[PDB]
């Protein structure tokens, strides 16, 4: 059905995403059990990590488009990512490595993430109809990799330890690199412009120098989230001043404020929703025992099923508003299940968490799939910078919000933790509902401005 390089790109993406979510699904639990962080410390550190992983995505597009070529940068990003996964597995021998290793993952992901997408865009004549089909199967690839990692990684860490989990993450990356290097001929005429002139070693050295610098700055900021807070605050207020100085752009600003709320909510799945499933949900579904941390797999799962269907079936403004209403309903379902549908011992049915993750995943399909692809319909380089800046801020604020559900290591009664989760999830849902009602009100004016 699809060109041959499509399958190569599909599987490089699948494997890289397996490594990434292999780390993401265990990281907060690893901060708590392995490094003996408290839950509040684990949550804010995860917030900083996520923020950097997302903020540095801007780099890899520029580096692939203009410095080294798309395919060279796929290779380089795979290599730096694998180094980072093995460094994280080495952190267990050498604990002081942890932040450097996470910085290596962030920078690695930054160089890599934008680039398979680019390459797949260049596998099709410019107005080939199969482009949308192919991009939905690419998102399904991302989400199959994420499904498998979020399901199996916690099981592996429990049965074999973390060094083995992180080394498998590296091995996934190494076989992504091997399948790329094997299928390299399939993409010999595909690439950006630097891909086809000889490689400039001056530029490669600037990229390696700057990568190393950023690894160290990442490690510093995740160790010291209070200066990360101020760096991002001042960066935000300054870039807001310079956006206001220089109204399709104003509609883009309102849409980014909406995406910020979405990412604060998205940030909860590996933190507060994760620990809610650990503390106040039954670890058994359909008669099978599961690792509760595996519950995160419910987000890619629902994506994998809902993306074909929803591709079968207002425009951008309503789709953003719809997605916000969905996210609101996910957190209101979580609060409801805690307030009224709980066992005398303080535990709830995992079907409520299946439904929470459905609502969340649908909000993701409506917003983050459908955002910068058509924020680019409203615009440039400065607003991509401001986008990635503000979404990294979103993830930092997400970690701070998650800390409202933090439980001290010495509480052991689920009836003590259940009111905390339900208060926070209920207020998150009420605020997101208000935000969505304002979005709905603004849909007509916004829809005029897009004309």
């Amino acid at each position, epitope marked *: 059905q699809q060109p041959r390089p499509f399958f190569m790109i599909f599987f490089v993406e699948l494997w890289e995403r397996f490594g990434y979510y292999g780390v993401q699904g265990v990281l907060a639990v690893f901060f708590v059990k392995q490094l003996g962080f408290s839950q509040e410390q684990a949550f804010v550190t995860f917030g900083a990590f996520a923020a950097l992983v997302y903020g540095l995505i801007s780099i890899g597009g520029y580096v692939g488009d203009h410095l080294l070529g798309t395919k060279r940068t796929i290779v380089l990003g795979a290599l730096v990512l694998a180094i980072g996964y093995f460094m994280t597995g080495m952190s267990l021998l050498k604990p002081d490595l942890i932040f450097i290793a996470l910085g290596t993952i962030a920078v690695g992901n930054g160089l890599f993430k934008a680039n398979p997408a680019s390459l797949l865009s260049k596998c099709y004549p410019p107005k080939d109809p199969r482009l949308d089909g192919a991009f939905t199967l690419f998102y399904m690839s991302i989400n199959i990799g994420s499904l498998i990692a979020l399901s199996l990684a916690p099981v592996i860490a*429990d049965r074999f330890g973390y060094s083995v989990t992180y080394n498998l993450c590296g091995a996934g990356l190494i076989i992504a690199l091997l399948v790329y290097i094997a299928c390299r001929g399939m993409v010999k005429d595909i690439g950006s412009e630097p891909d086809f002139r000889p490689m400039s070693f001056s530029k490669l050295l600037y990229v390696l120098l700057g990568s190393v610098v950023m690894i160290f700055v990442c490690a510093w900021l995740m160790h010291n989230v209070e200066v990360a807070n101020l760096v991002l605050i001042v960066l935000s207020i300054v870039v807001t001043i310079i956006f206001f100085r220089q109204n399709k752009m104003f509609v883009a600003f309102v849409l980014m404020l909406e995406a910020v709320v979405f990412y604060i909510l998205y940030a909860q799945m590996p933190t507060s929703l994760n620990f809610f499933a*650990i503390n106040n949900v*039954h*670890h*058994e579904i359909l008669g099978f025992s599961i690792n509760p941390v595996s519950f995160q797999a419910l987000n890619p799962f629902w994506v994998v099923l809902a993306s074909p269907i929803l591709a079968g079936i207002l425009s951008m403004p309503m789709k953003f508003t719809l997605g916000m209403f969905m996210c609101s309903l996910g957190f209101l379902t979580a609060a409801a299940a805690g307030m009224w549908f709980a066992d005398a*011992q303080g*535990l709830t049915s995992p079907w409520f968490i299946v439904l929470v993750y459905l609502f969340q995943s649908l909000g993701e399909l409506f917003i983050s799939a459908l955002g910068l692809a058509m924020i680019a319909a409203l615009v440039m380089g400065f607003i991509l910078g401001m986008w990635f800046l503000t979404q990294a801020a979103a993830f930092l604020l997400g970690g701070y919000v998650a800390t409202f559900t933090a439980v001290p290591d*010495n509480i*052991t009664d689920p009836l003590e933790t259940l009111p905390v989760y339900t208060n926070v999830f209920g207020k998150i849902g009420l605020v997101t509902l208000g935000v969505a009602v304002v979005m709905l009100l603004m849909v007509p004016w916004l829809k005029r401005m897009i004309a």
Partner: nanobody
Amino acid sequence: VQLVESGGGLVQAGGSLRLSCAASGPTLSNYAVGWFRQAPGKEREFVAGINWSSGLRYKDVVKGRFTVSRDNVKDTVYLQMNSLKPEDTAVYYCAARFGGMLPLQPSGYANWGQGTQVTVSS
């Protein structure tokens, strides 16, 4: 996923026993281990437990007499029972649940030992 209990037996009122629970496969380190007991003709009740980060929970009638502790090198959890009384006679089970919580009913726990008889004579 399967836990082995050792250490029960027969003891006179005022004596002491020590039970121990170990797991085969998963590291009990990630687990809240609770100890339940069933006396003849009653239901399993929660006795005493430790979570994955050393928080402890105790049924009121064993406070001051039983101690749960955890050896994270040997990957074993212990229940030290002192000042034993005849009303402590029961089948004792260990049970493991992932996480920091120790719920009170048996349905909160997925992994169960087979049981050790503990008898306390007058």
